[PDB]
Design a protein around this nucleic acid. Structure first.
Ligand code: NA
Ligand code: NA
Length: 327
DNA sequence: CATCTG
DNA sequence: CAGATG
């Protein structure tokens, strides 16, 4: 956790790089298990050889750990931190819609900057365009004070369109959090479940309203169950308009809301712990259900949940307010 | 994993 | 349809 930090750090720098610049998934994947094991590792890695002793730790990494331990640096890391190419890739990637893949193409075409991009707005697609247009806004966290205001609009509109809708804003917002990166809504309806053959309108009607009133400004991707867009809190009395924010809305069969709701709410750590506890309790959980674990190895049959309560109940545990869902 | 692009 | 992105 702090005993082998540099190591684990350089290891991650390297890994990332393989994957983003080179195309080196194998290698990339290599650096990663390496950082992971050394991570769990209990002592002070004092040399390569000590390290090598670890699974996932080959001669190559070992070599690196040496130079690093030997000198506060690593030539490779040194070289890579300069290379404008590598940098451009790291940068372009920040644009929403531009992945590494794209980042590679663009660079080879000489587009390495924000300006480069605007100039070539033509080579970018819709997402990518939007993503370039709100680059600033997009990196700006979202303060609860706005989140509450956002949440308020969304729920009220959902309600209007159908009294029977059930919306929930998950994420850290849900666990208390002072700010957040984007708004995530879970949506369901009675008339929508496991079996129930579709009802696309279910998502689309809401989306529509949200744009009706102007809350939603752009569409990143609209599917029949997942919406990826942009919204904005109406600028009050002109002087201070709000940054554009990412927002997503997803339709879920009512018969599997809570697990999802539970699930999305995190944190990753709270999940796992519960997940692992579920297991003890003779259960299983995943993003959509909770199944009674047979003994034959495994077994299924989705246990029936009407709230986040039912879930906990099942694994016989303490209902935790979302705030305490930390770890 | 679901959506897009081409 | 593969392949890319979130
Ligand atoms: Na990106
Ligand atoms: Na292939």
């Amino acid at each position: 956790e702090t005993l082998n930090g540099g190591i684990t750090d350089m290891l991650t720098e390297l890994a990332n790089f393989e994957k983003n610049v080179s195309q080196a998934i194998h290698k990339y994947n290599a650096y990663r298990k390496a950082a992971s094991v050394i991570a769990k590792y209990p002592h002070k890695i004092k040399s390569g050889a000590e390290a090598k002793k670890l699974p996932g730790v080959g001669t190559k990494i070992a070599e690196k750990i040496d130079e690093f331990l030997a000198t506060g640096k690593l030539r490779k890391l040194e070289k890579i931190r300069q290379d404008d190419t590598s940098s451009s890739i790291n940068f372009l990637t920040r644009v929403s819609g531009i992945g590494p893949s794209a980042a590679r193409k663009f660079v080879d075409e000489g587009i390495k900057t924000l300006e480069d991009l605007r100039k070539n707005e033509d080579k970018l697609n819709h997402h990518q365009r939007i993503g370039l247009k709100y680059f600033g806004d997009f990196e700006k966290r979202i303060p609860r004070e706005e989140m509450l205001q956002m949440q308020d609009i969304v729920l009220n509109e959902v309600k209007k369109v159908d009294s029977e809708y059930i919306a929930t804003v998950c994420g850290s917002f849900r666990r208390g959090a002072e700010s957040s990166g984007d708004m995530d809504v879970l949506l369901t309806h009675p008339s929508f479940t496991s079996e129930s053959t579709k009802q696309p309108k279910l998502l689309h009607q809401v989306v529509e309203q949200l744009q009706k009133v102007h809350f939603i400004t752009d569409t990143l991707s609209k599917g029949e169950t997942k919406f990826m867009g942009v919204c904005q809190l109406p600028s009050k009395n002109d002087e201070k308009e709000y940054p554009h924010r990412r927002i997503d809305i997803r339709l879920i069969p009512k018969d599997q809301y809570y697990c999802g709701v539970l699930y999305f709410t995190g944190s990753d750590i709270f999940n796992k712990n519960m997940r692992a506890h579920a297991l003890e309790k003779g259960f299983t959980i995943n993003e959509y259900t909770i199944r009674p674990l047979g003994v034959t190895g495994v077994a299924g049959e989705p246990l029936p949940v009407d709230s986040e309560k039912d879930i906990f109940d099942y694994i016989q545990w303490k209902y935790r307010e979302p705030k305490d869902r930390s770890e």
